[PDB]
Design an enzyme around this catalytic site. Structure first.
Site, PDB file in Angstrom:
ATOM      1  N   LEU A  69     -13.580  11.089  -5.912  1.00  0.00           N
ATOM      2  CA  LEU A  69     -14.753  11.928  -5.598  1.00  0.00           C
ATOM      3  C   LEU A  69     -14.751  13.171  -6.480  1.00  0.00           C
ATOM      4  O   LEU A  69     -13.705  13.648  -6.898  1.00  0.00           O
ATOM      5  CB  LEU A  69     -14.724  12.378  -4.136  1.00  0.00           C
ATOM      6  CG  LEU A  69     -14.594  11.313  -3.042  1.00  0.00           C
ATOM      7  CD1 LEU A  69     -14.417  11.951  -1.663  1.00  0.00           C
ATOM      8  CD2 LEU A  69     -15.805  10.365  -3.103  1.00  0.00           C
ATOM      9  N   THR A 100      -3.816 -11.063   0.812  1.00  0.00           N
ATOM     10  CA  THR A 100      -4.600 -11.403   2.012  1.00  0.00           C
ATOM     11  C   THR A 100      -4.959 -10.233   2.899  1.00  0.00           C
ATOM     12  O   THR A 100      -6.149 -10.004   3.208  1.00  0.00           O
ATOM     13  CB  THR A 100      -3.826 -12.402   2.817  1.00  0.00           C
ATOM     14  OG1 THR A 100      -3.522 -13.491   1.959  1.00  0.00           O
ATOM     15  CG2 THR A 100      -4.629 -12.876   4.056  1.00  0.00           C
TER      16      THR A 100
HETATM   17  C1  LIG Z   1     -15.063   5.105   0.788  1.00  0.00           C
HETATM   18  O1  LIG Z   1     -15.720   5.340   2.035  1.00  0.00           O
HETATM   19  C2  LIG Z   1     -14.976   6.149   2.924  1.00  0.00           C
HETATM   20  C3  LIG Z   1     -15.698   6.165   4.265  1.00  0.00           C
HETATM   21  O2  LIG Z   1     -16.833   7.005   4.232  1.00  0.00           O
HETATM   22  C4  LIG Z   1     -14.708   7.536   2.334  1.00  0.00           C
HETATM   23  O3  LIG Z   1     -13.630   8.067   3.062  1.00  0.00           O
HETATM   24  C5  LIG Z   1     -13.967   9.260   3.757  1.00  0.00           C
HETATM   25  O4  LIG Z   1     -13.952  10.374   2.915  1.00  0.00           O
HETATM   26  C6  LIG Z   1     -14.343  11.527   3.627  1.00  0.00           C
HETATM   27  C7  LIG Z   1     -14.613  12.667   2.656  1.00  0.00           C
HETATM   28  O5  LIG Z   1     -13.466  12.977   1.890  1.00  0.00           O
HETATM   29  C8  LIG Z   1     -13.286  11.885   4.670  1.00  0.00           C
HETATM   30  O6  LIG Z   1     -13.794  13.037   5.321  1.00  0.00           O
HETATM   31  C9  LIG Z   1     -12.781  13.834   5.960  1.00  0.00           C
HETATM   32  O7  LIG Z   1     -12.590  13.459   7.300  1.00  0.00           O
HETATM   33  C10 LIG Z   1     -11.529  14.170   7.903  1.00  0.00           C
HETATM   34  C11 LIG Z   1     -11.309  13.557   9.276  1.00  0.00           C
HETATM   35  O8  LIG Z   1     -10.905  12.215   9.084  1.00  0.00           O
HETATM   36  C12 LIG Z   1     -10.339  11.663  10.293  1.00  0.00           C
HETATM   37  O9  LIG Z   1     -11.362  11.223  11.158  1.00  0.00           O
HETATM   38  C13 LIG Z   1     -12.195  10.226  10.585  1.00  0.00           C
HETATM   39  C14 LIG Z   1     -13.311   9.866  11.557  1.00  0.00           C
HETATM   40  O10 LIG Z   1     -12.772   9.092  12.612  1.00  0.00           O
HETATM   41  C15 LIG Z   1     -11.364   8.985  10.255  1.00  0.00           C
HETATM   42  O11 LIG Z   1     -12.172   7.949   9.729  1.00  0.00           O
HETATM   43  C16 LIG Z   1     -10.276   9.382   9.272  1.00  0.00           C
HETATM   44  O12 LIG Z   1      -9.508   8.246   8.918  1.00  0.00           O
HETATM   45  C17 LIG Z   1      -8.596   8.601   7.861  1.00  0.00           C
HETATM   46  O13 LIG Z   1      -7.374   9.097   8.375  1.00  0.00           O
HETATM   47  C18 LIG Z   1      -6.899   8.201   9.347  1.00  0.00           C
HETATM   48  C19 LIG Z   1      -5.760   8.822  10.158  1.00  0.00           C
HETATM   49  O14 LIG Z   1      -4.614   8.934   9.350  1.00  0.00           O
HETATM   50  C20 LIG Z   1      -6.515   6.875   8.682  1.00  0.00           C
HETATM   51  O15 LIG Z   1      -6.051   5.949   9.638  1.00  0.00           O
HETATM   52  C21 LIG Z   1      -7.710   6.267   7.956  1.00  0.00           C
HETATM   53  O16 LIG Z   1      -7.232   5.190   7.166  1.00  0.00           O
HETATM   54  C22 LIG Z   1      -8.311   7.338   7.052  1.00  0.00           C
HETATM   55  O17 LIG Z   1      -7.409   7.657   6.006  1.00  0.00           O
HETATM   56  C23 LIG Z   1      -8.126   7.733   4.758  1.00  0.00           C
HETATM   57  O18 LIG Z   1      -8.837   8.955   4.624  1.00  0.00           O
HETATM   58  C24 LIG Z   1      -7.990  10.092   4.614  1.00  0.00           C
HETATM   59  C25 LIG Z   1      -8.813  11.375   4.531  1.00  0.00           C
HETATM   60  O19 LIG Z   1      -9.354  11.626   5.813  1.00  0.00           O
HETATM   61  C26 LIG Z   1      -6.996   9.975   3.455  1.00  0.00           C
HETATM   62  O20 LIG Z   1      -6.133  11.089   3.418  1.00  0.00           O
HETATM   63  C27 LIG Z   1      -6.163   8.715   3.633  1.00  0.00           C
HETATM   64  O21 LIG Z   1      -5.232   8.611   2.570  1.00  0.00           O
HETATM   65  C28 LIG Z   1      -7.114   7.542   3.627  1.00  0.00           C
HETATM   66  O22 LIG Z   1      -7.704   7.530   2.354  1.00  0.00           O
HETATM   67  C29 LIG Z   1      -9.440  10.464   9.956  1.00  0.00           C
HETATM   68  O23 LIG Z   1      -8.889   9.917  11.137  1.00  0.00           O
HETATM   69  C30 LIG Z   1     -11.854  15.664   7.979  1.00  0.00           C
HETATM   70  O24 LIG Z   1     -10.743  16.383   8.472  1.00  0.00           O
HETATM   71  C31 LIG Z   1     -12.232  16.181   6.595  1.00  0.00           C
HETATM   72  O25 LIG Z   1     -12.726  17.502   6.682  1.00  0.00           O
HETATM   73  C32 LIG Z   1     -13.300  15.259   6.024  1.00  0.00           C
HETATM   74  O26 LIG Z   1     -14.394  15.232   6.922  1.00  0.00           O
HETATM   75  C33 LIG Z   1     -13.131  10.718   5.645  1.00  0.00           C
HETATM   76  O27 LIG Z   1     -12.055  10.868   6.561  1.00  0.00           O
HETATM   77  C34 LIG Z   1     -12.951   9.393   4.889  1.00  0.00           C
HETATM   78  N1  LIG Z   1     -13.111   8.249   5.775  1.00  0.00           N
HETATM   79  C35 LIG Z   1     -12.285   7.187   5.769  1.00  0.00           C
HETATM   80  C36 LIG Z   1     -12.406   6.186   6.884  1.00  0.00           C
HETATM   81  O28 LIG Z   1     -11.436   6.999   4.897  1.00  0.00           O
HETATM   82  C37 LIG Z   1     -14.251   7.478   0.861  1.00  0.00           C
HETATM   83  O29 LIG Z   1     -14.344   8.762   0.258  1.00  0.00           O
HETATM   84  C38 LIG Z   1     -15.046   6.446   0.038  1.00  0.00           C
HETATM   85  N2  LIG Z   1     -14.514   6.368  -1.326  1.00  0.00           N
HETATM   86  C39 LIG Z   1     -15.255   6.563  -2.435  1.00  0.00           C
HETATM   87  C40 LIG Z   1     -14.560   6.526  -3.767  1.00  0.00           C
HETATM   88  O30 LIG Z   1     -16.470   6.769  -2.432  1.00  0.00           O
HETATM   89  C1  LIG Z   2     -15.611  -9.655   9.355  1.00  0.00           C
HETATM   90  C2  LIG Z   2     -14.722  -9.735   8.113  1.00  0.00           C
HETATM   91  C3  LIG Z   2     -14.029 -11.092   7.959  1.00  0.00           C
HETATM   92  C4  LIG Z   2     -13.078 -11.493   9.101  1.00  0.00           C
HETATM   93  C5  LIG Z   2     -12.594 -12.878   8.687  1.00  0.00           C
HETATM   94  C6  LIG Z   2     -11.602 -13.670   9.551  1.00  0.00           C
HETATM   95  C7  LIG Z   2     -10.275 -12.961   9.748  1.00  0.00           C
HETATM   96  C8  LIG Z   2      -9.331 -13.955  10.400  1.00  0.00           C
HETATM   97  C9  LIG Z   2      -7.929 -13.398  10.582  1.00  0.00           C
HETATM   98  C10 LIG Z   2      -7.089 -14.596  10.982  1.00  0.00           C
HETATM   99  C11 LIG Z   2      -5.620 -14.247  11.058  1.00  0.00           C
HETATM  100  C12 LIG Z   2      -5.525 -13.508   9.725  1.00  0.00           C
HETATM  101  C13 LIG Z   2      -4.184 -13.128   9.103  1.00  0.00           C
HETATM  102  C14 LIG Z   2      -3.581 -14.423   8.578  1.00  0.00           C
HETATM  103  C15 LIG Z   2      -2.300 -14.142   7.838  1.00  0.00           C
HETATM  104  C16 LIG Z   2      -1.837 -15.405   7.131  1.00  0.00           C
HETATM  105  O1  LIG Z   2      -1.974 -16.546   7.582  1.00  0.00           O
HETATM  106  O2  LIG Z   2      -1.266 -15.206   5.924  1.00  0.00           O
HETATM  107  C17 LIG Z   2      -0.863 -16.424   5.322  1.00  0.00           C
HETATM  108  C18 LIG Z   2      -0.045 -15.826   4.186  1.00  0.00           C
HETATM  109  O3  LIG Z   2       0.366 -16.942   3.404  1.00  0.00           O
HETATM  110  C19 LIG Z   2      -0.839 -14.934   3.240  1.00  0.00           C
HETATM  111  O4  LIG Z   2       0.065 -14.360   2.305  1.00  0.00           O
HETATM  112  P1  LIG Z   2      -0.573 -14.089   0.859  1.00  0.00           P
HETATM  113  O5  LIG Z   2      -1.314 -15.292   0.506  1.00  0.00           O
HETATM  114  O6  LIG Z   2       0.721 -13.843  -0.098  1.00  0.00           O
HETATM  115  O7  LIG Z   2      -1.455 -12.796   0.719  1.00  0.00           O
HETATM  116 CA   LIG Z   3     -11.453  14.657  -6.209  1.00  0.00          CA
HETATM  117 ZN   LIG Z   4      -4.917 -14.762   1.179  1.00  0.00          ZN
HETATM  118 ZN   LIG Z   5      -1.232 -16.450  -0.929  1.00  0.00          ZN
END
Ligand SMILES: *[C@@H]1O[C@H](CO)[C@@H](O[C@@H]2O[C@H](CO)[C@@H](O[C@@H]3O[C@H](CO[C@H]4O[C@H](CO)[C@@H](O)[C@H](O[C@H]5O[C@H](CO)[C@@H](O)[C@H](O)[C@@H]5O[C@H]5O[C@H](CO)[C@@H](O)[C@H](O)[C@@H]5O)[C@@H]4O)[C@@H](O)[C@H](O)[C@@H]3O)[C@H](O)[C@H]2NC(C)=O)[C@H](O)[C@H]1NC(C)=O
Ligand SMILES: CCCCCCCCCCCCCCCC(=O)OC[C@@H](O)COP(=O)(O)O
Ligand SMILES: [Ca+2]
Ligand SMILES: [Zn+2]
Ligand SMILES: [Zn+2]
Ligand SMILES: *[C@@H]1O[C@H](CO)[C@@H](O[C@@H]2O[C@H](CO)[C@@H](O)[C@H](O)[C@H]2NC(C)=O)[C@H](O)[C@H]1NC(C)=O
Ligand SMILES: *[C@@H]1O[C@H](CO)[C@@H](O[C@@H]2O[C@H](CO)[C@@H](O)[C@H](O)[C@H]2NC(C)=O)[C@H](O)[C@H]1NC(C)=O
Ligand SMILES: [K+]
Ligand code: NA
Length: 781
Positions: A667, A159
């Site tokens: 990538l 979920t």
């Molecule tokens: C799916 O689509 C996404 C969105 O475009 C792509 O993910 C992006 O990849 C790019 C290029 O590699 C990354 O660029 C780097 O950005 C960092 C700065 O990143 C920080 O700031 C951005 C902007 O606010 C933010 O979104 C980032 O968020 C990451 O880190 C957060 C803090 O911990 C975390 O909460 C969030 O989940 C996210 O983590 C994910 O990305 C990081 C890498 O940044 C990774 O290590 C982690 O495991 C997660 O995968 C972050 O605060 C710069 O420093 C670099 O130079 C570079 O610019 C983007 O950050 C990244 N964006 C996101 C949201 O993930 C995917 O590549 C794409 N996948 C495919 C297969 O196409």
């Molecule tokens: C814009 C994208 C879509 C947004 C959609 C609506 C999101 C509504 C969030 C409502 C509160 C959501 C979290 C509910 C959690 C919950 O009720 O879990 C019941 C569990 O049994 C699920 O466990 P499992 O089935 O094992 O994954």
């Molecule tokens: Ca790579």
């Molecule tokens: Zn579910």
């Molecule tokens: Zn379930």
């Protein structure tokens, strides 16, 4: 501290943000112990239930009742949803004939059609087959709107990862909610679906739709409902918000139901006991639609009916125990069930031995109902590796089974399995002015919906993993006009400039191309690099002078093409290529010398058009580094399967090439990121090899004379030094290779991320259609 002494008078489910010390009256309030002392009393009325009865019509308003049937309820926006049917002779929405909604029919003051997302938990795609006998409201939405036969969830098919993917357009590895439970080793903290840690914002990445809306000045209703609020109150609340003054009214709304997931777990997906929960959900959809009709909104709003994942038959009797494979399971922690993630019980425990654990879990029972993977080895289509919260050691579990740590029933259903498994597929229906009328669309992935919801709301989406435009065909209007990415690197077209005498590689040997072997145009290179187009009778390639091999090799194979063999005297035949400098070439000495690594060819000599041509296949510029283990797969693919595809599909166009992804982020690697080379050399070793096989959707037309839509299947095969993944690999290739390939099926889009190439740039189809083609996944289910 929150001053709980305030009152929720005139504030119930207010939309305004309210922080300490002021007490709250919204959904999150209970979860935060911040509700005002009269929240439950003022805001959660239950008196008299949820339906008007004849004996209540034109009653005098009692503010104690759950909903109203008094004459003023309409303008106050708080009638029971069935008020007009019972009290004013109106019809339930479901009883009304379907009629095309060609443009929004909205009341004065509505500037755009609101969007209501109706999410249902554990709604298996096949439940829709129950139709109007069980779910008449939903069946009307489905038959009269736009529907997919199913929608593919993300892995793991549980979920939290799926709801947040729906909200963000991101893979879990990117948004961070990689399971219902997870451990973050940097936080040293643990997240659970139940409990308070999940409320901390540090877990949640990307930008979910409500924040995207808000940052762009579009108002959102709640995307969270406290479990204690009944569905009827959730529906009444949404309808009340829709009745608000123009300057308060939200544009996007979400409803969530925890059914039919709960009953699916208890009774299993095919249980007779599933009928009742499905009826109840349908009644709720009816309340909403009746309510919308009461507000004159039923031909105004866009409604999305969408699930998070499906449901499978899973019972206590089908559980694998790790204690059967491993000596000391008390020292590991397992995220268990329909998936496995393993880490030491004590974080960072130095005695943790992952290679020993994996060895003991690999092909140890003939009928083994899970398979261990280091996460970098999981199928690339799952996109499940690039996050510190994903344990290195993963178990992919067979459908219908559980994995548990040790033996140390009340459930018949579960989900979480590989997201291509049929039982895990879920539902999508779009209904309203912006969707098409009575239209079925192919299945698609839930990562695509965020872009479309942004479209439906006039929003610019945050960067996400959808391919914007790929779902334009669901929409009557508000489609997104995609634009072709611009080519970054143009090819060199080198002619002869060297003589055999120029080469010291250690090798020994004893138009109408571009038009015919690139049926869809040459791929565009979207990064800065140096490469050459190379023409041949039977194939074309973009040879990289940097990676010393082709980025891509493209060729067409007719249905009646003939498969020849590789003559014994040419077994080890590799020829230098007088178009490419010796310095930009691989050398056979490196291979001769590397005890572990062999080589293969992208264009297979087996498919040569003639011995004069076949000799081209042995060029040094058609060669790539392959482990013998991989060669077993690749040779079978090159020799048996490509021809078999050509025969079945009326010829095939093939593009094959290397992929480098050493940091498993999905990538293209830059040079600095490549970590393995052929011994003694600078020839880089691909982590994967891809192939994209295209033909005419109308099989009556040959691949090269296709007038209309295309058909594509692709793969991203892992380049590994053993076949430990394939438990039957000691047998002949005909007994295991295709099975491996099916598991590693891929979208063209996946290959594009991993290669920096852009395919299908020259076709007779719309760019939108091509985007749909690129997102297609051939599942083999
Ligand atoms: C799916 O689509 C996404 C969105 O475009 C792509 O993910 C992006 O990849 C790019 C290029 O590699 C990354 O660029 C780097 O950005 C960092 C700065 O990143 C920080 O700031 C951005 C902007 O606010 C933010 O979104 C980032 O968020 C990451 O880190 C957060 C803090 O911990 C975390 O909460 C969030 O989940 C996210 O983590 C994910 O990305 C990081 C890498 O940044 C990774 O290590 C982690 O495991 C997660 O995968 C972050 O605060 C710069 O420093 C670099 O130079 C570079 O610019 C983007 O950050 C990244 N964006 C996101 C949201 O993930 C995917 O590549 C794409 N996948 C495919 C297969 O196409
Ligand atoms: C814009 C994208 C879509 C947004 C959609 C609506 C999101 C509504 C969030 C409502 C509160 C959501 C979290 C509910 C959690 C919950 O009720 O879990 C019941 C569990 O049994 C699920 O466990 P499992 O089935 O094992 O994954
Ligand atoms: Ca790579
Ligand atoms: Zn579910
Ligand atoms: Zn379930
Ligand atoms: C917590 O909330 C209560 C109720 O709102 C506050 O009580 C009010 O306090 C003010 C300031 O002394 C009085 O003038 C009012 O008569 C009180 N109202 C009622 C209805 O009791 C209380 O002040 C708050 N506690 C704080 C601010 O710490
Ligand atoms: C892998 O499985 C083997 C059993 O096949 C385990 O080997 C046992 O090891 C213990 C001590 O480690 C010995 O006392 C037993 O004699 C072995 N059993 C057998 C049947 O030979 C091994 O421990 C397992 N490895 C891990 C990491 O769990
Ligand atoms: K060798
Ligand atoms: Na094996």
């Amino acid at each position: 501290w929150t001053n709980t002494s305030g009152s929720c008078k005139g504030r119930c489910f207010e939309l305004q943000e309210v922080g300490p010390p002021d007490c709250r009256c919204d959904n999150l309030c209970k979860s935060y112990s911040s509700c005002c002392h009269d929240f439950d009393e003022l805001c959660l009325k239950t008196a008299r239930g949820w339906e008007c009865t004849k004996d209540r019509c034109g009653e005098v308003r009692n503010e104690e009742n759950a909903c109203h049937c008094s004459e003023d309820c309409l303008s106050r926006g708080d009638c029971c949803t069935n008020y007009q049917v019972v009290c004013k002779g109106e019809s339930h929405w479901v009883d009304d004939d379907c009629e095309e909604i060609r443009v929004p029919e909205c009341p004065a003051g509505f500037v755009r059609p609101p969007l209501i997302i109706f999410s249902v938990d554990g709604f298996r795609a096949s439940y829709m087959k129950k139709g109007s006998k069980v779910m008449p409201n939903i069946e009307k939405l489905r038959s009269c709107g736009t529907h997919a036969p199913y929608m593919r969830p993300v892995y793991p098919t549980k979920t939290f990862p799926n709801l947040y993917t729906l909200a963000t357009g991101l893979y879990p590895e990117s948004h961070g909610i990689v399971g219902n439970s997870m451990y973050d080793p940097v936080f040293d903290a643990t997240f659970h679906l139940r409990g308070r840690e999940k409320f901390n914002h540090r877990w949640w990445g990307g930008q979910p739709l409500w924040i995207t809306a808000t940052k762009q000045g579009v108002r959102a209703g709640t995307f969270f409902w406290s479990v204690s609020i009944p569905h009827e109150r959730r529906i009444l609340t949404i309808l009340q918000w829709l009745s608000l003054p123009d300057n308060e009214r939200p544009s996007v709304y979400a409803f969530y139901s925890e059914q039919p997931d709960f009953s699916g777990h208890k009774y299993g997906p095919f249980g007779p006991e599933m009928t009742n929960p499905l009826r109840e959900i349908d009644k709720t959809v009816g309340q909403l639609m009746d309510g919308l009709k009461q507000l004159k909104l039923h031909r105004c709003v866009n409604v999305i009916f969408v699930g998070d994942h499906g449901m499978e038959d899973v019972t206590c009797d089908r559980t694998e125990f790790l204690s059967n494979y491993l000596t000391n399971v008390d020292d590991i922690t397992l995220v268990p069930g329909t998936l496995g993630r393993i880490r030491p019980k004590i974080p960072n425990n130095l005695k943790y031995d992952p290679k020993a654990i994996i060895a003991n879990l690999t092909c140890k029972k003939p009928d083994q109902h899970f398979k261990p993977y280091m996460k970098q080895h999981l199928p690339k289509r799952l996109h499940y590796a690039n996050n510190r919260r994903i344990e290195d050691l993963h178990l992919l579990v067979e459908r219908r089974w559980h994995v548990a740590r040790k033996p140390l029933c009340f459930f018949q259903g579960d989900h979480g399995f590989d997201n291509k498994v049929n039982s895990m597929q879920t539902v999508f229906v779009g209904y309203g002015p912006t969707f098409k009328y009575r239209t079925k669309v192919p299945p698609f992935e839930n990562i695509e919906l965020y872009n479309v919801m942004c479209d439906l709301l006039g929003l610019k989406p945050a960067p996400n993993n959808g391919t914007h435009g790929s779902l334009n065909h669901l929409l009557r209007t508000n489609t997104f006009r995609p634009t072709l990415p611009e080519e970054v690197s143009r090819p060199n077209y080198p002619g002869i400039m060297y003589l055999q005498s120029d080469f010291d590689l250690g090798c020994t040997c004893d138009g109408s191309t571009e038009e015919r072997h690139l049926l869809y145009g040459r791929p565009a290179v979207l990064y800065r690099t140096s490469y050459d187009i190379l023409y041949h009778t039977d194939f074309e390639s973009g040879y990289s002078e940097i990676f010393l091999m082709p980025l891509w090799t493209s060729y067409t194979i007719s249905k009646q093409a003939e498969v020849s063999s590789i003559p014994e005297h040419l077994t080890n035949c590799v020829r230098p290529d007088v178009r490419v400098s010796p310095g930009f070439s691989q050398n056979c000495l490196a291979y001769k010398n590397d005890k572990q690594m062999s080589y293969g060819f992208l264009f297979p000599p087996y498919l040569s058009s003639s011995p004069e041509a076949k000799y081209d296949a042995f060029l040094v510029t058609n060669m790539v580094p392959m482990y013998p283990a991989f060669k077993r797969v690749w040779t079978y693919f090159q020799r048996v399967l490509v021809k078999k595809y050509a025969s079945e599909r009326n010829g095939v166009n093939v593009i094959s090439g290397p992929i480098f992804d050493y940091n498993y982020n999905g990538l293209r690697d830059i040079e600095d990121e490549i970590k393995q080379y052929v011994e003694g050399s600078s020839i880089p070793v691909p982590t994967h090899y891809y192939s994209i096989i295209t033909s005419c959707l109308d099989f009556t037309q040959p691949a090269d004379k296709c007038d209309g839509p295309l058909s594509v299947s692709s793969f991203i095969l892992p380049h590994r030094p053993d076949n430990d993944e394939s438990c039957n690999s000691s047998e002949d290739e005909s007994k295991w290779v295709e099975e491996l390939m099916k598991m590693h099926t891929a979208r063209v889009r996946d290959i594009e991320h991993l290669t920096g190439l852009d395919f299908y740039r020259k076709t007779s189809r719309s760019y939108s259609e091509i985007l749909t083609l690129k997102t297609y996944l051939h599942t083999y289910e």
